[PDB]
From a paper:
PSI mediates electron transfer from cytochrome C553 (or plastocyanin in eukaryotes) to ferredoxin, thereby generating the reducing power needed for CO2 fixation in the form of NADPH. Recently, an operon encoding a complete, albeit minimal, PSI complex was found in the genome of several marine cyanophages. In this work, we characterized both biochemically and structurally a phage-mimetic PSIPsaJF constructed in Synechocystis.
To explore the promiscuity of viral PSI complexes, we constructed a phage-mimetic PsaJ-PsaF fusion in the easily cultivable cyanobacterium Synechocystis sp. PCC 6803. To get a more detailed view of the PsaJF subunit in PSIPsaJF, we crystallized PSIPsaJF and obtained diffraction data to 3.8 Å resolution. A complete trimeric complex is formed from monomers positioned in three unit cells. In spite of the relatively low resolution, we find that the overall organization of the other cofactors in PSI is hardly affected in PSIPsaJF demonstrating the mild effect of the JF mutation on the overall organization and integrity of the complex.
Residue numbers in the entry:
A (entry chain F): 1 to 125
B (entry chain B): 513 to 585
C (entry chain A): 13 to 751
D (entry chain B): 659 to 730
E (entry chain E): 2 to 69
F (entry chain B): 367 to 439
G (entry chain D): 3 to 140
H (entry chain C): 2 to 81
């Protein structure tokens, strides 16, 4: 799969995966106004539509993407893992996308989320 | 009216970003740690180190001006 | 004279997974984001990859085969779209009322609105490629004919693609082989152009001409017999054009004039067609063909007859030019950039000749009627010709940096003019200033005199006027050419010079284009804009190697940003930076040309003809009186004709409406790059990077602001995009709405 | 112009003009007491910004007044 | 002093790697101003415009380093 | 209309200049000794915290504000 | 005093100007084993005479651009070149191979100047040298 | 004219001397680094300020710096 490897460094294969959502998603995505109007905000609660689900989507992607950069750092193959996406990294992080914000909850609690200010570089004042 | 206000907020923040950055890194950055020795306004620092064009604090005001005009527009 | 190395390179997919292998700098790996951009901008730079001129010539040879392949795929795509996603058959039935349309848009997200009504019960996007007009003149009468043509293209596409592989991985030509210039020419001059022109003349006579004659009669396509049926029944080919009774042998007995039944010299436009007589274009290509076969027998080859271009060149010396063309043979048979520089200059200038000739002498049926297609094919070939003659300056300079050798160029034409480059530019500089004042300065004289209420002082047909005495005198000769200076030509070559105002349907196909002072001025604006563009590019070639500011510029290379803030500042001295500035002026120059074309044809040519013969132009002839001030262009051309696109919201043209804005966006976006520098941008990234170091999400490929060159390359890339997207939408929305 | 095109181009264009005058008869009779040179890098940014600013307000003002005074 | 292989934190100030972590490669020349050669995981800005990378190593003084 | 458009353009110029000379202060007058550990110096200490966030808000405003307008268009 | 043979050259416009006869011009001498073609910094091509050559150029940078060429674009790398600054007063002034050896190579006798007993990052604050004609690097 | 300075961080790689196109620099003996030599700037009267020298030095930050100064006929690279 040397040629497949070279096809793999080609990101936009993901854009093809996105259009494939239509097979399953287009079926239910009919009209879709569920309770956008009724909110007990003590009057006029019609701003309650699904803004919140946007957060889970970006989180499952971001943390997995961070887990791709962090897990690759341990390998000590910086140039290769960046130019050609390692299957184990992209698979593990992206496949655990639903449980990704969950493991991110554990990472935040364990203090794995934020690195040291001392360790981080600072520019001359 | 809702949208043009946020558009203006964009206009004030980005203009402040430029002006404030250019002020803070006026003494120097890790691309030019000794910027203070060269003064406020200087051309650049040659093509060396990747390139240093429009790097000075004077050049920050310069880039900032285009955004003020736009914000006022 | 065939020489070949067998299997010089294995065919393995290992290299595909090792990006940047072709360069020793990139081969080891990426450490910064700059590596990525560099991988792309060095991909086709085969010179910088290997110094073996034999190896690169093999890369180039098989690069062309790859290109011919995609062009075949593209070209086949147009035929396939014309066969299955078109109303061509519907258009062939009623050419004068149906609008040509290909490409159906899918009903989704409300974009179905772009499928506008184009008549004939067909909904889709109206095309301006003039393909429908090409098909008829080519003798197409069925969708299946286009369909078979589309498949043939994919065959060719695959065949071209195989040849590229074969001639680099199986049998690669030797360096000696590519250098057979005298022989290479004899084949292109006769094999490609000669037989190509002869072979097509055979099609025009046996397919196009007889069929198209029936469309004049309006036999309708289905009643018309198939093309090959004209050959199965020579009686059919005889019933039209009686000169087939004595078919062959007048050619061989030299009678010829018998064939005047179908090899004519009418020189005009078929009044039902609005296009050039197919009888002329056939006699034409037959004449061109012969001329080209002939011209392909001049050069030396293996049979001792012919010429040595080396002999001819070297035997051209004069008092003023020392040793003359000596050495020119060598550099044109050792440097590809030397060849490319010339080939672009001419190919580019030619594509412009195509534009200026295709509008005055419409070679296709019902083309002249479609003012959108006329405007679209003209300004199109204008730009292409425009971009090419800029690259002509790029590689003209690269040759000087890379492949110019002083020893092989001593007191010859090349060396001699490098020794007065300061004299050349100093004068081209002055001419540009002279043209600068005496063209634009005139418009400012008018705009000011107008506003001061002094219309008697300004430059105008009505007031004082600069009359193009010569161009007018030239027209007078062209119109009076038949029956005198062209006795065997019935009518003049183009009615733009003068004569009857040809009309089809209720529209003007072509009519005399009078020249006034309004036209005199814009002509000297064109001469002005062209000269400045030459100055920027020419100066870029001669001072590519050295100057009084940087004598060692050649060592710095062709593509470098600068030589530091020293010497007062040395930004953009390189030849690449002369292509950079040369692009903006190629743009600014041609924008005025296509703006001249649009308004002039709208105002003083196009329009509707009433049965009596009186013409009503779309701009009512406001050109000669408003095209002499900038405010007039701002008002009576831009502000007025832009009303079509900005109000396109809610119609089939709504695309052009939002596309008109899209162009505006990337235009302004370009200014972000052209006004700033990476010095600021790198410092900004440092603050941004820190936020990732804070959350442990810093990328391995360290972020780096674009190179100073790329910063400029991206700048011009967007500025020219938006600048042309804007015009592209403005022209289409305008021309489609007017007719 | 001052914002897109940068110095080195103009410096190399000026010296050819310098050449012309020194070589032109009758004109060389006049010699500059100040050597001609292209604007500095900072200068060009400044002048480029100056023009960009003037044109920004003069264009908009002329539109504000005329549009409002013309219509009321 | 500092041994080869020891991971070190930099406290110079103007260094592109100031605050970042480096690795001591060698100690040279006995008596000299900047003996400690350090190699870094990621390159600096150094290089003419268009360079695909930078410098990996630089000499520091012993007094402006911290062991990790 | 003129008086309003006028005074805002005046104001816009003043705000830029205010930061311009604010940058010049750091280049030619700032003393890290006299201003050691005070509110002024500590700004420089976390300048990359300021800028990185001022960048985010601008990114946040620009993508959405432009986003809604292009959506409607 | 010292001289050579002017290279065989048809002439160019990129050459000298008023500065040469007003302010200063520079002179460059070199010895070549054969007559061979070389590139003029003033554009075009010329050929050096066998033996001693002499050439006047308008700028010091031009001579050094030729000097580096002479030492890099020939099979017999000519490193025998000497550059002078000649004033209109007749006064000449030796300039390149200054002391005798090229500056690339360390040579005893050269007095150090421009050096700093200090890191570049250890320069004083601008406020320190306020309203004094001096800059931090002084 | 412009000002050229050398700092104690130089490592005597001599790359700057052979980069300068106007012969402004030269190497001299020094006991501060292993190469036992340091860059010098005796002929600043002829430096234009191209900053080719700074481009060549490999120290984390430059050991040689060019502080642009009062312009002259020479420091502007004027051939007239
Ligand atoms: C399919 C079998 C095959 C294989 C395994 C190879 C393998 C190789 N080729 Mg060959 N080549 C092939 C077919 C093949 N090639 C064909 C069909 C052509 C004619 C177009 C060429 C012309 C060619 C040249 C001139 C060169 C090579 C080189 C190489 C070597 C390095 C280039 C590289 O891999 O980076 C991968 C690069 C790409 C995959 C480029 C893709 C970018 C575009 C968009 C392709 C252009 C369009 C294309 C022609 C048409 C596609 C669409 C169409 C089907 C509708 C490598 C051993 C180079 C070499 O020898 O190394 C120094 C060399 O210079 N090839
Ligand atoms: C290279 C030039 C070119 C261009 C710019 C297009 C562009 C287009 N094609 Mg065509 N096509 C081409 C060549 C080209 N084609 C060739 C050479 C063939 C024959 C092999 C075809 C056969 C073809 C078919 C059968 C269809 C298109 C369709 C389309 C449209 C939608 C594409 C799509 O499905 O999304 C990409 C999806 C992933 C789009 C306008 C579609 C169309 O016309 O709309 C209904 C359609 O179904 N094309
Ligand atoms: C040399 C130039 C030339 C070119 C570019 C063409 C091009 C074409 N011809 Mg050919 N033709 C030529 C010479 C040429 N012809 C000569 C010299 C003759 C005399 C025998 C013919 C006799 C001919 C016939 C009988 C037909 C074509 C047809 C066609 C078209 C269909 C292509 C296909 O699908 O397969 C295509 C436009 C076909 C068509 O449908 O016409 C529009 C068709 O059936 N041609
Ligand atoms: C290279 C392109 C080309 C090709 C392939 C052909 C092929 C043909 N032509 Mg020619 N023709 C051509 C160009 C071409 N023509 C040109 C340029 C002219 C103008 C001088 C003519 C004028 C011409 C005449 C007058 C006749 C032919 C005829 C023929 C056919 C003779 C075969 C036969 O009946 O026995 C043959 C299909 C003959 C024909 O129509 O079939 C009976 C016929 O008599 N052609
Ligand atoms: C006859 C065809 C032809 C050929 C074979 C070449 C070949 C070459 N050129 Mg030349 N060039 C040409 C025409 C041609 N050029 C013309 C007409 C111009 C005038 C604009 C130029 C201007 C030019 C310059 C300034 C340079 C070259 C260079 C080169 C070399 C490297 C190019 C490269 O790296 O690709 C890389 C290509 C890219 C990285 C893509 C850039 C992005 C593009 C082109 C924008 C396209 C806009 C897009 C179509 C519309 C937007 C759509 C979008 C929204 C999706 C290579 C030998 C370079 C060189 O010689 O190396 C030192 C170089 O400096 N060319
Ligand atoms: C429906 C269409 C839509 C689209 C196309 C976008 C697109 C975008 N959003 Mg928006 N967003 C939306 C709806 C949408 N959003 C709605 C309905 C809400 C209300 C909840 C938001 C609230 C929101 C916030 C607060 C932010 C964005 C941001 C962004 C940008 C970067 C995030 C990203 O996608 O990159 C890929 C994902 C990553 C790079 C990792 C995750 C990054 C995120 C967004 C932070 C994690 C979410 C967290 C729980 C909330 C942040 C803390 C909060 C208290 C401030 C991107 C342009 C970010 C931005 O503009 O920064 C400049 C930003 O911070 N969005
Ligand atoms: C209209 C043109 C334009 C645009 C879109 C921008 C946009 C931006 N500027 Mg720039 N600027 C401009 C002109 C422009 N500027 C000009 C003329 C100057 C004078 C030189 C400047 C000087 C300037 C400075 C000094 C700074 C900026 C900064 C910024 C960023 C601030 C973040 C933000 O506002 O929201 C978010 C981003 C956007 C609104 C732009 C996104 C554009 C699109 C449409 C997103 C979608 C991408 C699209 C799908 C890609 C497909 C393309 C494909 C076909 C190739 C933003 C990216 C600041 C910055 O860098 O932020 C930290 C910064 O400090 N600008
Ligand atoms: C600020 C940026 C922005 C935002 C917030 C939106 C938001 C929206 N757009 Mg607009 N759009 C934008 C920019 C934006 N757009 C731009 C720049 C363009 C020009 C290209 C468009 C062109 C456009 C069109 C033509 C249309 C929209 C439509 C929509 C709506 C579709 C809802 C949907 O996707 O359902 C469902 C999709 C999802 C929920 C996606 C996630 C599905 C996964 C599988 C769920 C996983 C859960 C775990 C939504 C309100 C559509 C509409 O109906 O308007 C009201 C519509 O037809 N947009
Ligand atoms: C309306 C404006 C006023 C009109 C007035 C009429 C002026 C007509 C212009 C005369 C051109 C002079 C040609 C030199 C005739 C000529 O070639 O001389 C001969 C000489 C070389 O001749 P040789 O004897 O060396 O030839 C033998 C060998 O060289 C073999 O090549 O060429 C030169 O010396 C270079 C001079 C170029 C001059 C640059 C002129 C730039 C173009 C100016 C004209 C533009 C008009 C537009 C179309 C091009
Ligand atoms: C459209 C198209 C296509 C198609 C094409 C075609 C198919 C065509 C063609 C063509 C052809 C089909 C051609 C042909 C032919 C020919 C020629 C060109 C000829 C010739 C000749 C000669 C010149 C000779 C003569 C003679 C003499 C004189 C002597 C004796 C006798 C003889 C006869 C030998 C394709 C799809 C691919 C692609 C796309 C486009
Ligand atoms: S670019 Fe920024 S740096 Fe390289 S030169 Fe023109 S200015 Fe001095």
């Amino acid at each position: 799969m040397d040629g497949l490897k070279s096809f793999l460094s080609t990101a936009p294969v993901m854009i093809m995966a996105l259009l494939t959502f239509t097979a399953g998603i287009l079926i239910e995505f009919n009209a879709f106004y569920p309770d956008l109007l009724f909110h007990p905000c003590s009057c006029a609660g019609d701003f309650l539509i699904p803004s919140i689900i946007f957060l889970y989507i970006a989180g499952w992607i971001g943390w997995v993407g961070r887990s791709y950069l962090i897990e690759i750092r341990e390998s000590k193959n910086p140039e290769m893992q960046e130019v050609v996406i390692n299957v184990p990294l992209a698979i593990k992080k992206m496949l655990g996308g639903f449980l990704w914000p969950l493991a991110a909850v554990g990472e935040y609690t364990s203090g794995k989320l934020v690195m040291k200010d001392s360790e981080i570089p600072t520019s001359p004042r | 009216d809702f949208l043009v206000h946020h558009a203006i907020a964009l206009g004030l923040h980005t203009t402040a970003l430029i002006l404030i950055k250019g002020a803070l890194d006026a003494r120097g950055s890790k691309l030019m740690p000794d910027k203070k020795d060269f003064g406020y306004s200087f051309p650049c620092d040659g093509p060396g180190r990747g390139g240093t064009c429009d790097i000075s604090a004077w050049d920050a005001f310069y880039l900032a001006m285009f955004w003020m005009l736009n914000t006022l527009g | 004279k065939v020489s070949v190395d067998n299997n010089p390179v294995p065919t393995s997919f290992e290299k595909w997974g090792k990006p940047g292998h072709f360069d020793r700098t990139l081969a080891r790996g990426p450490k910064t984001t700059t590596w990525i951009w560099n991988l792309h901008a060095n991909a086709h730079d085969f010179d910088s990859q290997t110094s073996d001129l034999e190896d690169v010539s093999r890369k180039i040879f098989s690069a062309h085969f790859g290109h011919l392949a995609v062009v075949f795929v593209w070209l086949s795509g147009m035929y396939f779209h014309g066969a299955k996603f078109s109303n061509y058959e519907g258009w062939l039935a009623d050419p004068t009322h149906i609008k040509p349309s290909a490409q159906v848009v899918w009903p989704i997200v409300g974009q179905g609105i772009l499928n506008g009504d184009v008549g004939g019960g067909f909904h889709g996007i109206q095309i301006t490629s003039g393909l429908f007009y090409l098909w008829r003149a080519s003798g197409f009468t069925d969708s299946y004919q286009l369909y078979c043509t589309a498949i043939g293209g994919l065959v060719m596409a695959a065949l071209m693609l195989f040849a590229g592989w074969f001639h680099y991985h199986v049998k690669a030509p030797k360096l000696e082989w590519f250098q057979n210039v005298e022989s290479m020419m004899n084949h292109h001059l006769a094999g490609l152009l000669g037989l190509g022109s002869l072979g097509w003349a055979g099609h025009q006579i046996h397919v196009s001409m007889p069929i198209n004659k029936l469309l004049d009669a309006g036999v309708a396509p289905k009643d018309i017999p198939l093309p090959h049926e004209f050959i199965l029944e020579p009686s059919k080919m005889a019933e039209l054009y009686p000169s087939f009774a004595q078919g062959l042998t007048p050619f061989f007995t030299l009678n010829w004039g018998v064939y005047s039944d179908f090899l004519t010299f009418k020189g005009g436009l078929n009044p039902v067609t609005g296009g050039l007589w197919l009888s002329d274009t056939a006699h034409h290509h037959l004449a061109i063909a012969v001329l080209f076969i002939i011209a392909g027998h001049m050069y030396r080859t293996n049979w001792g007859i012919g010429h040595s271009m080396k002999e001819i060149l070297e035997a051209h010396k004069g008092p003023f030019t020392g040793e003359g063309h000596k050495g020119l043979y060598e550099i044109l048979t050792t440097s590809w950039h030397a060849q490319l520089a010339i080939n672009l200059a001419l190919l580019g200038s030619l594509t412009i000749i195509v534009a200026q000739h295709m509008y005055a002498m419409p070679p296709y049926p019902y083309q002249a009627i479609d003012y959108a297609t006329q405007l679209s094919l003209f300004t199109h070939h204008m730009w292409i010709g425009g971009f090419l003659i800029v690259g002509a300056g790029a590689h003209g300079a690269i040759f000087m940096v890379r492949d110019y050798d002083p020893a092989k160029n001593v007191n010859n034409l090349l060396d001699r003019m490098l020794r007065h480059r300061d004299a050349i530019i100093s004068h081209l500089n002055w001419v540009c200033i002279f043209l600068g004042f005496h063209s634009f300065g005139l418009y400012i004289h008018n705009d000011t005199m107008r506003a001061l209420g002094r219309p008697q002082d300004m430059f105008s047909d009505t007031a004082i006027q600069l009359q193009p005495i010569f161009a007018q005198w030239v027209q007078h000769l062209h119109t009076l050419a038949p029956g005198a200076t062209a006795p065997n030509a019935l009518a003049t070559a183009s009615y733009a010079f003068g004569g009857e105002t040809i009309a089809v349907a209720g529209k003007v196909a072509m009519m005399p284009i009078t020249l006034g002072t309004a036209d005199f001025m814009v002509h000297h604006i064109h001469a002005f804009t062209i000269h400045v563009t030459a100055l920027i590019l020419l100066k870029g070639v001669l001072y590519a190697r050295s100057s009084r500011l940087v004598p060692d510029k050649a060592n710095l290379g062709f593509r470098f940003p600068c030589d530091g803030p020293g010497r007062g500042g040395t930004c953009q001295v390189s030849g690449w930076d002369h292509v950079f500035l040369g692009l903006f002026w190629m743009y600014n120059s041609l924008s005025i040309v296509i703006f001249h074309f649009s308004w002039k044809m709208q105002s003083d040519v196009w329009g509707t003809v009433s049965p009596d013969g009186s013409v009503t132009h779309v701009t009512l002839g406001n050109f000669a009186q408003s095209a002499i001030t900038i405010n007039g262009w701002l008002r009576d051309f831009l502000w007025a004709q832009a009303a079509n696109v900005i109000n396109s919201y809610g119609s089939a043209l709504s695309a052009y409406g939002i596309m008109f804005l899209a162009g505006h966006f990337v235009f302004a976006f370009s200014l972000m790059f052209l006004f700033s520098g990476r010095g600021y941008w790198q410092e900004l990234i440092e603050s941004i990077v820190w936020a990732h170091n804070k959350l442990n999400v810093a990328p391995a490929i360290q972020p780096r602001a674009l190179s100073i060159i790329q910063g400029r390359a991206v700048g011009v890339a967007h500025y020219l995009l938006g600048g042309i997207v804007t015009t592209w939408a403005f022209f289409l929305a305008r021309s489609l709405s007017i007719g | 112009m001052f914002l897109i095109s940068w110095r080195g181009y103009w410096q190399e264009l000026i010296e050819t003009i310098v050449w012309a005058h020194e070589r032109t008869p009758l004109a060389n009779l006049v010699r500059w007491k100040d050597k001609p040179v292209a604007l500095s890098i900072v200068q060009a940014r400044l002048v480029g910004l100056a023009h960009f600013t003037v044109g920004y307000v003069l264009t908009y003002a002329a539109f504000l007044i005329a549009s409002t005074a013309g219509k009321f | 002093a500092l041994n080869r292989g020891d991971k070190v934190r930099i406290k110079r100030t103007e260094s592109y790697w100031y605050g970042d972590v480096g690795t001591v490669a060698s100690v040279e020349k006995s008596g000299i101003l900047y003996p400690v050669i350090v190699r870094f995981d990621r390159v600096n800005y150094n290089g003419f415009s268009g360079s695909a990378s930078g410098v990996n190593t630089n000499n520091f003084a012993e007094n402006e380093l911290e062991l990790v | 209309a003129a008086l309003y458009t006028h005074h805002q353009y005046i104001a816009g110029f003043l705000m830029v200049g205010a930061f311009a000379h604010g940058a010049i202060f750091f280049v030619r007058d700032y003393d890290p000794v006299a201003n050691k550990d005070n509110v002024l110096a500590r700004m420089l200490e976390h300048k990359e915290a300021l800028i990185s966030h001022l960048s985010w808000v601008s990114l946040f405003l620009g993508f959405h504000t432009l986003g809604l307008y292009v959506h409607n268009d | 005093e010292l001289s050579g043979q002017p290279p065989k050259f048809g002439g160019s416009t990129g050459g000298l100007l008023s500065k040469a006869n007003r302010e200063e011009k520079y002179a460059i001498t070199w010895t070549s084993a054969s007559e061979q073609v070389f590139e003029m910094p003033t554009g075009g091509a010329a050929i050096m005479n066998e033996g001693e050559n002499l050439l006047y150029l308008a700028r010091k940078e031009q001579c050094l651009a030729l000097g580096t060429q002479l030492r890099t674009k020939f099979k017999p790398k000519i490193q025998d070149y000497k550059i002078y600054r000649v004033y209109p007063s007749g006064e000449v002034q030796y300039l390149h191979p200054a002391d005798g050896v090229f500056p690339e190579k360390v040579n005893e006798g050269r007095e150090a100047q421009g050096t700093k007993t200090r890191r570049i990052g250890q320069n004083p604050e601008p406020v320190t040298i306020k309203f004094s004609g001096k800059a931090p690097y002084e | 004219s412009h000002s050229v300075k050398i700092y104690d961080t130089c490592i005597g790689c001599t790359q700057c001397v052979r980069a300068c196109p106007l012969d402004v620099l030269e190497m001299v003996p020094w006991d501060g680094c292993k190469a036992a030599q340091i860059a010098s700037s005796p002929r600043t009267e002829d430096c234009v300020g191209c900053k080719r020298c700074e481009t060549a030095c490999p120290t984390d930050f430059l050991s040689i710096r060019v502080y642009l100064g009062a312009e002259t006929t020479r420091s502007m690279g004027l051939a007239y």
